[model samples]
Target: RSFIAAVIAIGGMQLLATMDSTVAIVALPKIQNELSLSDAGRSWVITAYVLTFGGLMLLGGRLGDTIGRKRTFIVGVALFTISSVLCAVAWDEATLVIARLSQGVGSAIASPTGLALVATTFRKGPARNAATAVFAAMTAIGSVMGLVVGGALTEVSWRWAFLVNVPIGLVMIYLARTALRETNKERMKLDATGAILATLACTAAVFAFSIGPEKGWMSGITIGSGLVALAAAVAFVIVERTAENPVVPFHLFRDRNRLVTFSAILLAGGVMFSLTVCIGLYVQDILGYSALRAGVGFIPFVIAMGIGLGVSSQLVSRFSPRVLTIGGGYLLFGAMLYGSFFMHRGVPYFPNLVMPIVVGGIGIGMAVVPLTLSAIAGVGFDQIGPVSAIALMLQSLGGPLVLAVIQAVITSRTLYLGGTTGPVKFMNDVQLAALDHAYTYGLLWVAGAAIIVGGMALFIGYTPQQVAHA
Candidate 1:
């Protein structure tokens, strides 16, 4: 029964998170026009939310151990619900960004608890597998659902996107409060230093990337932030070595397979985020499709992903992670290749774009679950919450940063190749072609990343040692 509640809570939490993230893309133009935000400011709106969500996850996870999972879970859900309301009521860009940060904070709290709750509540084996399958499916499903729902809401009112969360959130809270019981085995000490340093490291790195456009990569802010970020990351490691209770235990990364899994998750997430955004722009801006049409176009992709996850669950026990992962990578590559052909504006919908999206969605669906399982495969039971927290942080941050780079690169290449620009108001045929071309280049980079990840997946074959059985 508790396991049931955990799954429900996690799914609802995901719906809240994914909807807010994707819906904002449609809302972006509206906010841009209203605030008269520059490109840099516009990027901040998205980056701020991602950074805070990723940054605070470690702390949130540890809180699960210390304060108790059920308490943390309820608190996290409550905070997330309130933050959603705040975001809905935001009147200015600054206020909106601040609200997003709070939203991220709430997400950080909710996410790890939700994930950890399932692991603790369910006994391992069939029950666990069933729970995980449902959890994983909801995550992938939520991303697509967000796109469709976001588009519809944006058409009705951008505020509706955030507003919708309130009712669903309230219902979930009531269920959790009544049905959930607290769970935490050990009394864990807080690792404040490691947590703070680790968060600063991620936050600084995101800042470096987000500001790279307005301030060149070499600028003081970017350079300093990057350097500090790196240093803080290193310090986090050193502090963890001696801390009685480290937030991120270094031993977690000792498993080669787990390490490989983390890298693959980051890479896959980055590619996924980039593709989703590019498709949205291509459909709405370049192809001149309505928001609703664009959203509906992605329905096939969502369905494919759900089907693929079902298929993956059946095969995971029988086959090696290497085979599935590499296959997924190749599938994504093929999808990107298909995406490449859609460069021209007049490309037909039937055989051109839809097929590729469906293929890509399935590929991503296959890859994500195994990769995530691999990531948390080896950690000690007590540390699962922290492990989940870190893994999610990387996945979340990698997505936005990767997407931003794709956007910047495509935009810059378009302007440079055409030899015209002060600010990109309207793109031309040649410029548009350049943008798509550069996106292809970025996708190619993702393909290359996929190959590396796939190879590593093979090299790291599943073992007891791989899963911390030793």
Candidate 2:
């Protein structure tokens, strides 16, 4: 029963934290209309949340070690819950963006801590493996749930998406208070210098990419931001090396298996994140599906992912993680390659898109959990928080960066094809064709990434039994 309670509390927090990542996606139009936001302002609502979340995750993880996990977690939940209320009542773009930023800060704290909770709570064997699978599954499912839930709620009011979190978060906090146990606190002080540099570096890099598509990638603001990001990143490395308690320990990367696993995760993250955003936009913008239809369209992907997770969980105890990861990578590559072939204007949804959708879904389902398990397979309990945070940080940062590159491809291709700038409310054949061309390029990029990573997965040396016992 205590195990069940822990799952509920920790998993519930994970669900809520990740759900917020994409919930606002389907509701963006509604939010813009209600707040009278500019195009840039509209984008900032999503950007604000992700930027802070990715930037602070490293520090948040270290905090879980230095402070107490449960204490930090409760504080995070309180902040996130309050921020949601503020978001629901936001009267202007500034208000909403600020609230979203705060929400991200809260999430950065809770998410890694929640994962650490699972690691500490369950014994390091099949029990932990099973729990980790569920946790990873939620990370996959939460994004899809956002689309579905956001679609339904946007029809009523965009406010409902944020408002819905209040009750759920409160319940999670209540349960967590009663059921969650705190980990032993270390005597080290927080690594303020490393944290500041890391946060600034990540934030600057993400911001540069976020605006790169709209502003020319070579524009002065974008170039300046990129330079700042580069400098800050170098400084972060230096600080981490010298700091008594670094936000990111340099030694963590010395593990050959972990390094390979991180690379795989980043590459896969780029492909998966690109798939979610691009596919959703393709169906709605070019295929002329409604927001709700687009949301429903993801159902196949979600169900396939669930099925994949089941297969992976069972298979993890039987095969090498290398074999499963490589196989899953090939599946994903095949799906994307297959997807690229059908990216034509006016393509029907039935056999054209659904096939690749299901294929990718299943492949992603098979790959993600195993990849996560392999990432932290041999890490000690003390290092789990930072290691988990790094994996997630890569994922969080990779998505938007890759998506930005994809969007840039779309824009450049559209312009080259004589497509008009700004939104295409009524997409003509020419515009749709241009979009199709761009999407094909995006899918090819993803396919290439999957293939490369699949090949690289061969180097990751965790067997199912190894991970199970880790």
Candidate 3:
């Protein structure tokens, strides 16, 4: 019973942290209706949380080391719970966006630290391994649950999506404080420079893409932000080169297999998230499904995702990771391409949407499992945590970057055709048609990216046998 308390404390927060990434996705239309957010604001509602979560994750890990894991975990949960209340009570776009960003910051601090606490809290043996496996499972469960719970809560009120986190987070904080033991604080140097520069680079890039559509792609501010993104990225590389404790050790990429695997995972992660956003909005904004129905509609996806994950472990023994990756990428390519052309406002959900949803989910599940294994395949025992953390870092960061670009395309095309990203109930035939194409255009981007993911697999020659030996 006592052991269970710590698991619930850490795992519950992990679930909430990851679940938030997609929770707002299903509720965007409702959020936009009440807040009167612009198309950019609509997307930013999602981006604000993920960008901060992904950007500051390394810093959060460092904070845990500097302060002590248990302290960081308590602070993170307290901050997250408070921000959840702020999110629930927010009045306008500015307030809500800021609150969500704060929520991300809280999770950034808590999530990694909580994971580290597992190593300290649990005994070193099967018990610890079991806890770690559950932790990883919680991450997967959180993303899928977001769509279902997001939909169900949005049926009552969108604010409930945020409010649901409060009581749960409060409990987590209590359990964490009481049940989890503190880790000894490390004397390692913090890589504030690398963390900030990486964060700045991603933030500027998101800002540029978010505004470029509304302000014109070639506008001075857009160009200036773009240049800033480029400069910051280069500066991050330089900073990491000199820093004693770099946030991202460039040496991790020295393994050819890890490099190719990380890039492919980034693209795959982007396609999965962008599709979730596009489809979640499509059903609600175009097909006029209720938020509950829209969220529940992803149930097939969750099931198919399980099928892919379950079967892949068995097949991993026979095929190279590259083969599995290529196959999964092709599945995604076909799924997105079909969705791009086949999805229409008038079409029913039955066989039409279900097919692509299931296929794409399966593709993502299959690809991610092997790709994750491949990334840490040859790393030393000391480097395993960093390798896997970077894998997750790339995956989390990829979502907002891809969504920003897709939203820019969707926003520009919609406006050019005289459509708004607001309620489709008020739209005329012209606006409705325009909105439809704009949404589908984003799917085409997913399709092309899927092809690239598959092509990138050619460079990853790591076989399952290699992972075993490593």
Candidate 4:
């Protein structure tokens, strides 16, 4: 029952997580203008949520272990729902970022507890695998759903995206209160020190990375912040080594398979988040599609992902994870490669973008299941909380961190190529040409990352024999 409940909760929460990220893209120009956010402040809209979510995750899991998973789930949903309401009503950028941080805190509480519940309740094998696949499917589709719905809702009001979560969160609370059984354990060591250091170090690193592009990366403030982050990270490692209960046990990396799996998760999350928005902008900004049309244009990728996931789930028993992982990697790389060659300012939508997107979608759909499997592959039930914590942390950091770097690259390239976005009434042909080139270069970076990680993913060894022994 705990496991079943998690499947439902995670599916819902994924919609919440993704809705904020994608839906807001359409509203970016408006949100920036209205809030008077500086270019540096603009990134906070996304970074605030990422920082809080990544920073607080281990504590969230340990809190669940000590108090109760059911209670934590309820509280987390309530916190998130309330924070979403605040975000909708926020009058300024500072208030909005604050509210988003609160929402991240709520997600932190819910994500690990929800997964830990599944781990404790379900005996591993096909049952656990199915639940995880469904969870991953929700994540893949949630963004596509957000893209369409977010586009529509943004047309109405950007706040609606945040406001909509209230109802879903309320429903989750109701279902959880009635259906979620409490998993209360005694005297779980909280790993408070490790959690604090990890959270601070990660938050600093993310903050430095997110803003470095807008404010010169080599500027004093940026360099200082990065140096501080580095020092903090070193401290975190030292603390984790000696702590009574480490937030992230250093030994988790001892398994070559686990390390590879985490790498895949990071790379996949980064590429997925960056490319979706970049392509959307390419269509809407460069090619002149209406926001609604651009959202609808993504239907092919959405459907392809769903179909691929469904097919891959069926064949998981027949094939090793490496086959799907490698297949998906090659297809995604090919899609990106083809996309880079084709995405010009006047390119047609159908054959130009759709085919590559379908290829990429199918690739992602195939690999999504395998990555989730690899995330917890061969782990004993007792370690689920930490494993879940680390996986979520990687995902939390991956999206925004990479996006910032990509944006930095694009912005710098645009400047070097002599294009000015601000104060320019309309982008001249040269500026448009530069912007297109910027996107192409960024896509190539994403392609490179995907291919490297895809190769690493195939090397991850997971056999039935190993699972049986564990």
Candidate 5:
């Protein structure tokens, strides 16, 4: 019974946080319309939440180490719940973004601690394994559910995407308060400087990319922000070297195999997240599907992913990580490249999109298990927390930066074709054609990202036997 309560609290939080990733995607077109935001500003809605969540996650974990897990978790959930309310009430682009940022902070706090809670609450063996399975299942199911529900909610009001979390979050907190136990506190110092600098670096880089398409890459704002990003990144490295407890320890990257793993995770995450947003927009903005219809359209991709996951799970011990990742990567590459060059405005969904949509889904799904196993492979039990936290960070942070590049490419190509920069609602064929072509050009990066993941597989020197022992 206690195990049941714990799973409800922890698993429910996991589901809510993952759902937050895509819940706004289908509703974004409407959000953009109501708030009068540009294409760039709209992507911020997605990126803001994720980037902040990823950026601060390490810090959140440390708080769990020092501040005690249960307290940190309650605070995290409370903040997430309150910010969900703020997002619902947001009247302007800035307000919504600010609210989203708060939600990320809450998530950063809640997520790591929630995972830690499982470690404490469940004893080793079957019960713990079952609890973690529940945890994992919710996470995988979350984003797909978010896309569909976003559409259903958007039909009533886009605010419902934000509002849907309120009751759920409240229940999560109540359940946690009843079922959760506190964990040991550490004496380690918080890496406040490292955390702040890391966030500054990414936020600056993301901002530079966000404004680059419209302001001109050479424009003062874009250029200055880029430099700021560089400076903050350098400062972060310097601070990490000197800090008593660095938020990102250098030891995690000591292995070359791990370096490539992190990079591949980032690239995979970037593509996975950015691609989802792009398709959500395409189905609604370009294909003229209703929000609800657009949400449901993702069913094929979900099914494909499920099949890929099932197959890959079975193949893990049979094939080496290299085989799984490389094979999966190429399959994804083909899907994206096919769409980049061939998929167009008039192309119907039947056979044409099935290749890109379904294949791409399967491709990514295939890569994920291998990638995850490889992440923790050869890692020590003591440092596993940090390694896994960084993995999640890379995955979460990849979306915004990757989305930024795609957004820049889309906007620049659109301008070259004589299209307007912002909303797609009112535009001539020439302008619309320009926008369409821009989306196609934008897909090249997605293809580039996919292939890079495959190439990185070459550097992963270990065989499946070695991974199994690890």
Candidate 6:
């Protein structure tokens, strides 16, 4: 009962951490209207949170090693709860955006520690693998639930979305105190220089991706930010190698399989974000479904993903991680390829999108646990927090970069095929057909990316026995 309760507490906190990423998507319009937010303010509502969350993750992970996981988690939960309440009561745009930024800080501290806690709390083998499955399953389900919950809450008031976190956050904090025990802390000085460099680099990269589609990738602002990101990344490596207590240990990358696993997760992140956005747009914008209806439409995906996770829990200890990842990758690729052919505007959802989504969700479910396990495999307990943070950071940072590029593809194709005019005027059959073509092309790219990841999955050489003993 204690173990189950601990998992529930940890999973609940993780769900809270991730669900916010998508929860506000459907509520944006309502939020804007209520706050009278400007266009920039509207964008900042999401961007600010993402920037801070992705930026601070590396530092947050290191903090867990330096201070302690339980203490850090409690601090994070308290901060998150307070900020959530601020968000719920915000009377203006700035207040909400600032509150959201605070929320991101809380998440950055809590999320990596939460994952690390799993490693500390569960014994390796069936127990650990099952815990990992629950973590991955919640991540998958929470993202989908975000849309549905956001849609429902927006129907009443957008404030409810933020307000809902208060009680949950408080409960998670209390449980963390009671259910989780502290692990040993390493006595090392914080690598302020490396942390600054990495945080700036990540924030710049995330910012560039966020603006690239709208501002044009070639625009001076976008190019400048991209350059800054590149420079900071280069500088970060140098800083890490020299810093007394590097924020991110360079030796962790010495394991080739782990490196490849990170690459696979990065690519997978792109697929996750793109598919969610593309499918939502397809159903709502083209099929003329309400946001609420579209959110509900993903129930099949959620269910299949949960089922997939259950299967993964059973298989991770029975097969090599390489085999499982490759098989799952192929399944995902095949599903995306199959769905690409039916991307036309008037395609039936039941026989077309439904099966592909369900299959893809299952594939993702099968792959996520092994990928996570592979990345952190063979790392010592002391390093688990930072390693998990790097894995997650790659996953989070990769999403916007891929999403921006694909969205640009969609927009450019739509404009080219429908002719030069305002988008509002192009809403005729020509536009519909253009949208169909764009979606088809976009899905093909997703399919292609999945197959490429399948190829990369071949490099993850960790076996079930290795993971069980790790």
Which candidate tops TM-score?
6
When sorted by lDDT, best at the front, the candidate numbers are: 6, 2, 5, 4, 3, 1
Residue pairs with colliding backbones in model 5 are: none
Computed on alpha carbons, the lDDT of every model, listed in order, comes to 0.72, 0.78, 0.73, 0.74, 0.75, 0.80
Worst 10 residues of 5 by lDDT: 124-133
**Per-model TM-score versus the true fold:** 0.87, 0.90, 0.76, 0.87, 0.78, 0.92
- Residues 1-470 of candidate 5 have per-residue lDDT tens digits of 87788877876767888787667655776877788988779778877876677667777766765566678788999999999999999989889889989998898878877666655566533454445445655665777678678767567787777878888888888988898876544556567888788778876776676668778989999999899999999988987887776677796686678898788888878988788778667767777876667657767777787677667766766688788877877788888788878877877878887768888778777777667666656654344455657777788678778898888888887888898976787887678888887887888878777767678778987676655422
Winner on lDDT between 5 and 6 is 6
lDDT at position 410, candidate 4: 80
lDDT of 3 by residue, 1-470 (tens): 78777777777676888677667666777887788897678778777886677667766766655456678788888888899899888989889889989988988787767655655566443354345445555665777677678767666788888777777777777887788776453456667787788778877876787678778999999999999999999999987888876666777677666678788778777877787677767787788886567657767776777677666655666677788777776787788788788887889778898998888778766666566556555554333334545666777668777888888889899999788766667888888999988889877877777677778789988766764322
User: Between candidates 2 and 4, which one is better according to TM-score?
Assistant: 2
| Location of the lowest summed lDDT over 10 successive residues in candidate 4 | 461-470
Candidate 4, position 22, lDDT: 73
* lDDT against true structure, model 6: 0.80
Runs in model 2 lying further than 4 Å from the true structure:
184-187, 207-231, 342-352, 412-418
- lDDT score of model 1? 0.72
Error of 1 at 443 (Å): 3.6
lDDT by residue for model 4 (15-70), tens = 66776667666577778767788776777887788777876787786776556677
lDDT of 1 by residue, 57-111 (tens): 8788788777788888778878888888888888877888898888888888888
Give the residue spans of candidate 5 off by over 4 A: 1-14, 25-55, 69-71, 90-98, 112-140, 170-236, 337-342, 346-350, 408-422, 430-438, 465-470
lDDT of 3: 0.73
When superposed on Cα atoms, how far off is each prediction in RMSD? 3.3, 2.7, 4.8, 3.2, 4.5, 2.5
Considering summed lDDT, which 10 consecutive residues are worst modelled in model 6?
419-428
